[PDB]
Design an enzyme around this catalytic site. Structure first.
Site, PDB file in Angstrom:
ATOM      1  N   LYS A   1       0.883  -1.152   0.000  1.00 56.52           N
ATOM      2  CA  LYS A   1       0.000   0.000   0.000  1.00 56.52           C
ATOM      3  C   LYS A   1       0.928   1.210   0.000  1.00 56.52           C
ATOM      4  CE  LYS A   1      -4.282  -1.678   0.685  1.00 56.52           C
ATOM      5  NZ  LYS A   1      -5.453  -1.327  -0.172  1.00 56.52           N
TER       6      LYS A   1
ATOM      7  N   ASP B   1      -0.553  -0.977  -4.679  1.00 58.18           N
ATOM      8  CA  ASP B   1      -1.827  -0.273  -4.674  1.00 58.18           C
ATOM      9  C   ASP B   1      -1.572   1.126  -4.092  1.00 58.18           C
ATOM     10  OD1 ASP B   1      -4.331   0.736  -4.283  1.00 58.18           O
ATOM     11  OD2 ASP B   1      -5.098  -1.013  -3.164  1.00 58.18           O
TER      12      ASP B   1
ATOM     13  N   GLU C   1      -2.176  -0.558  -8.981  1.00 56.94           N
ATOM     14  CA  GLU C   1      -3.592  -0.432  -8.681  1.00 56.94           C
ATOM     15  C   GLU C   1      -4.018   1.004  -8.381  1.00 56.94           C
ATOM     16  OE1 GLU C   1      -4.927  -3.345  -5.820  1.00 56.94           O
ATOM     17  OE2 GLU C   1      -6.779  -2.246  -5.357  1.00 56.94           O
TER      18      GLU C   1
ATOM     19  N   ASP D   1      -9.627   0.114  -9.186  1.00 59.19           N
ATOM     20  CA  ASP D   1     -10.348  -0.296  -7.984  1.00 59.19           C
ATOM     21  C   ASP D   1     -11.447   0.715  -7.676  1.00 59.19           C
ATOM     22  OD1 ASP D   1     -11.385  -0.979  -5.520  1.00 59.19           O
ATOM     23  OD2 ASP D   1      -9.486  -1.126  -4.486  1.00 59.19           O
TER      24      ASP D   1
ATOM     25  N   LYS E   1     -15.581  -5.528  -5.785  1.00 57.49           N
ATOM     26  CA  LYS E   1     -15.842  -5.667  -4.355  1.00 57.49           C
ATOM     27  C   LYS E   1     -17.353  -5.648  -4.156  1.00 57.49           C
ATOM     28  CE  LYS E   1     -11.590  -3.310  -2.984  1.00 57.49           C
ATOM     29  NZ  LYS E   1     -10.949  -2.388  -2.007  1.00 57.49           N
TER      30      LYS E   1
HETATM   31 MG   LIG Z   1      -7.448  -1.093  -3.278  1.00 66.24          MG
END
Ligand SMILES: [Mg+2]
Ligand SMILES: [Mg+2]
Ligand SMILES: [Mg+2]
Ligand SMILES: [Mg+2]
Lengths: 369, 369, 369, 369
Positions: free
Chosen positions: C163, C191, C218, C243, C267
């Site tokens: 991240k 990401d 991402e 995303d 998601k």
């Molecule tokens: Mg994400």
């Protein structure tokens, strides 16, 4: 200046008659009112009226995102820095334009009162003197609508908006009905609230409406289909207006890129208030897209907020905020000189809130400090 | 409120050293100053510094279009209604952004003084606390530029802007020169002021600049060629900024449509002042185009005007108004805390005009009532 | 079958360590749990974990739109007709995918239990046997992240997700840090959670990451900018995944049209559950876009729901649901065979809910009949 | 579960009258029936009716690719994992949608029987209650078609489909013929089965059909020309439907990209069965393209399979499977409540196969284990 407290009032504005559109009927109108207190004793009023079918916000949901998410992050914040206020809100939560609008409006109210000046003076000054008011006829039978227009006709009204969208063959039936009933000098605009769904149905309907002289067709297809809107525009000479399809600059960008519309219907509740609405007007202006400031059925608070934006922009050529004159009780006193609206010169929203009326309309409330 | 009179001062701001760029050398800077009087005794200052090579306006031409065309139509007009003021000006004459900027700025000055508030408070509130200042190195020899940067380095400066554009093989020569001279932690941006003319020359130059870590290349091709800019952007990973190619929303629209740039350089003198500049920022925001508020070499008057716009907008991430610190005499007192600029909280432009300095710099003047 | 009652539990799942990403830090994870009762005695569990920064839904707001808007309209409705259930919800309110997901999941749980079959059997059958699990390293310092990876390495883990997104120069600093630390056989995906904002910053970052062999980048830019994503994809050979830019079929359509991505992160909380997620997978398949089923930090309930979708689709090639193994207490018992996930053959979600754990984690609740 | 054996029956369904269309006349209808046996004793029926002119599959060719290519690879395979089943078939052979459909249907039959539930419950649940049935009038003379419609009119029928496409000047001749003959309340749709070949002929024909109020024109040009379809759509306001031009997601992608149609005619025989058909519906939904489930003249087996898909999807708004009521003998008993179809609640296809009828219609057969 600093925000010291924010009161939240979940009220219900009573309607003289049921408001009927393509995707629902309304007997009254739930609304969230906000009272913003500052360390300087200056107070501002804001309003958020959610439309579940458009922004996915509800009466209760808005009250709570205001209570637990937005307001706590705003205490101690300066309402004079509108750009900053919005930056804080956007950073704490994405979307939720209605809730944000409620806060945005109160900040401008406070700003205007603080500078002893009407809101429009803080966003460009006064540009318009007045706007004609158009009467919206709720979905009814072909003669029930032709009739309701006959009445308002003899009260000064020069233009009407027909809400249609239940069945193409029927909606058309209602149009020439009122067109014939009111002559050919009365302006008529039709809003189908996504009722025709796609471009095929829409184009079929439009061929049967070329002779009726309609000012423009509003949101004929489902909100998310901007592509369909551009396709329709490529095959018709009737001006097209996008409403539910436009909320924030995100869709404005798409509308400009695809040339999907002749005009857009900006609503404070869809973009997050006065400041975002001004930004939309500036964006639409770059592409020569005419703007209208419409609204959800709102009290004097949000309604005046909408008018202040409208009155300050040359690109905004029509207005559709008539909630104050559909309710039997209003918490504010925005004055309409039917068939026209003119704004006064009073500071802030230039409105007065009747505490007693507010309190009797409140179903539940809370305070955040 | 009503405009009662407008004074026009054609002055000349003395420069410590000759300002050299791609299309010309400057020993000093001609400017037009305006003093706007109102029936309420409140006075505002505005400024117009014309760049013949960019907007086709000259020192004398601006003075006269202000005197015979714009000001006579503004007497009796209300400076508080900025949208209206611009509508009047646009209706009487097309373009002429520098002249219009001079008037726009004075109106905001008056507005702020009237509401006892700084200009940025009238256009969105304060968003930024401060901005770093970058030092612009005029076109010189490879070592003369590497040196001038070495000096400013030991004075706090963290970023520089190299003016290039005489000859690709030479301009490059100067770049690694200063890059090597200042290490790899000092930010460097290059502005070629249309010097490379087209995309072929530009793309050739860029391949020789990939290792030097340049923040961005500014206006490499001729102003009118937005297409070339988009073509360049399609074949390079260096951020691109458009300056002379952008004046009003007219080219902003084209830049967005063709995806011609990563960032734009907004200048009050190119778009007509504070109000038009704010509209550009909002438009650029819709497309995710970062903005910078630059300028022509201007006095404290226009410079502060530019900063007020910059300080009020999140989309404006860099600033380039350094005229006040290039002159040996200024008619205003905008204070720089080199290497940073922070705006005070004073009303209007938050500046004080030295009447004596103004008068000694005036070459000729007139008053219109 | 008929829904007789729906219980709403606003709980809080405790986290072993603070979860840190680009736009926020999490000490625990608020969640809404739903228990759906039917006239046939069969009960289903659903879950909704809102991310204010992605869908504009909050913990409290979701609880309430479920309580006052969605659930009342669902009482008496048949949970076996998933298409119908979604039609009803969409008709009563637009968007609100997290709230709708909570209901969607409970309906599938009931469906599976009713047919004594696991959920994946109701949406295509079992396709995958297992998926490797990748370890997500929260935003930390260059060596603190290189280290956390060193640990998980000696526990079977074959791939990690870094991240990043606080500062390009820093984020890069962290990458080669862990890449060097783990050799060149350990898969690494990054990401940035919109951290780089635009294509200019992104493309600059990417040139410094070509040698590190990253599986894919991402969501490098702000969610709403699909255009920027396509522009980036046109100038880089690194696979790109969208995303936050993808929620419902609305953006899926845009992603396909503009060729904005190599892969998408589906998601359940962004699209409204299992059924909508399956539709997205089918849509992505038509354009050859690879899919991943990721998630918000969720309990065993939503997590298994996500896995059931993943395990049933060939187009879904990676999975990222690791909430159950980040919490110190779970209301469910989804079993992970780290570093792999395999689903059992049990009916519905194939999970067991610990009533005691649910109740102790509940902060407030209600029942709707 | 495991497939233990697959029986293949090459049968011939007798037609009450010759079925006539643009590219051929049919006295009866060759079909391939499959009986799938599992280790659990559960058996499923599937059907494949090939149309040489559309998918390039023939009666005998389908029988053999099933016998020597598809079935041997399916023995021992689990029919419950539909996604897996299709993956296996696609991997062993490309295309051959009719043969694959035959297997796909049997798998769903088995699935439904196994879970004691109707097929539609395995693909989204029940959404529709019933669909009106439209009567297809085979290519005949202007008065022979006007007449056949007069008959069905007095039997409840509310809408008809005219098969045309032999000669534009003649096909038109037949249209107003029946339109005049049945009044202006009876819905009429026309299918030209590629008869007009290109956009020039098509557009010429369409100008002579604007006053007849046709619901939509189906596949006017040659199948492979999707471009022509988009060109036609750009110059006409008549809704357009693509049939032969659409088989799998491959052309669906193209249709969406080029905006070639208002609606598509999905047929299990063109895409490979129930599962692929569901994927097409989801894909069409993303673009707002309305769907119809049509068919080749099929027995109760494939016909019910088609209805199960139709009944489970909101995006499917019309249906055209009338084979069971064109034959004088059917191996199944799908019940039609003319002029409507309603599906029962029985497990699997909810049909019963008459072994005796199957056997007497079988021309040749084989078994694969
Ligand atoms: Mg994400
Ligand atoms: Mg509307
Ligand atoms: Mg420059
Ligand atoms: Mg056909």
């Amino acid at each position: 200046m600093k925000i010291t407290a924010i009161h939240l009032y979940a009220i219900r504005l009573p309607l003289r008659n049921p408001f009927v559109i393509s995707y629902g009927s309304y007997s009254d109108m739930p609304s969230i009112i906000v009272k913003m207190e500052t360390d300087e004793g200056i107070i501002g009023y804001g309003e958020g009226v959610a439309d579940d079918h458009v922004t996915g916000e509800s009466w209760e949901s808005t009250f709570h995102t205001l209570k637990h998410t937005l307001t706590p992050a705003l205490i101690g914040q300066n309402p004079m820095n509108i750009e900053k206020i919005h930056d804080m809100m956007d950073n704490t939560i994405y979307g939720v334009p209605t809730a944000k609008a409620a806060i945005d409006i109160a900040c401008f109210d406070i700003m205007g009162k603080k500078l002893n000046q009407p809101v429009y003076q803080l966003i460009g000054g006064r540009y318009h003197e007045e706007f004609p008011v158009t009467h919206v006829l709720s979905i009814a039978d072909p003669e029930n609508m032709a009739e309701e227009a006959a009445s308002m006709i003899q009260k000064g009204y020069q233009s009407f908006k027909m809400k249609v969208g239940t069945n193409v063959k029927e909606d058309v039936k209602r149009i020439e009905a009122v067109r014939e009933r009111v002559g050919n000098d009365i302006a008529i605009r039709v809003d189908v609230n996504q009722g025709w769904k796609n471009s095929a149905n829409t184009l079929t309907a439009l061929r049967s409406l070329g002779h009726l002289n309609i000012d423009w067709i509003e949101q004929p297809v489902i909100a998310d289909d901007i592509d369909a809107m551009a396709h329709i525009r490529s095959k018709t000479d009737l001006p097209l207006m996008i409403d539910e399809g436009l909320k924030s600059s995100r869709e404005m960008r798409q509308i400009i890129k695809l040339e999907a519309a002749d005009k857009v219907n900006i609503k404070l509740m869809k973009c997050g208030g006065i400041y975002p609405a001004v930004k939309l007007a500036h964006q639409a202006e770059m592409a020569g897209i005419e703007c209208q400031v419409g609204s959800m059925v709102e009290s004097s608070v949000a309604s005046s907020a909408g008018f202040h934006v409208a009155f300050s922009k040359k690109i905004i050529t029509s207005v559709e905020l008539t909630g104050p004159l559909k309710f039997t009780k209003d918490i504010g006193n925005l004055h309409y000189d039917v068939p026209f609206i003119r704004l006064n010169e009073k500071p802030g929203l230039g409105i007065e809130i009747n505490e007693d009326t507010l309190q009797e309309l409140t179903v539940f409330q809370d305070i955040v400090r």
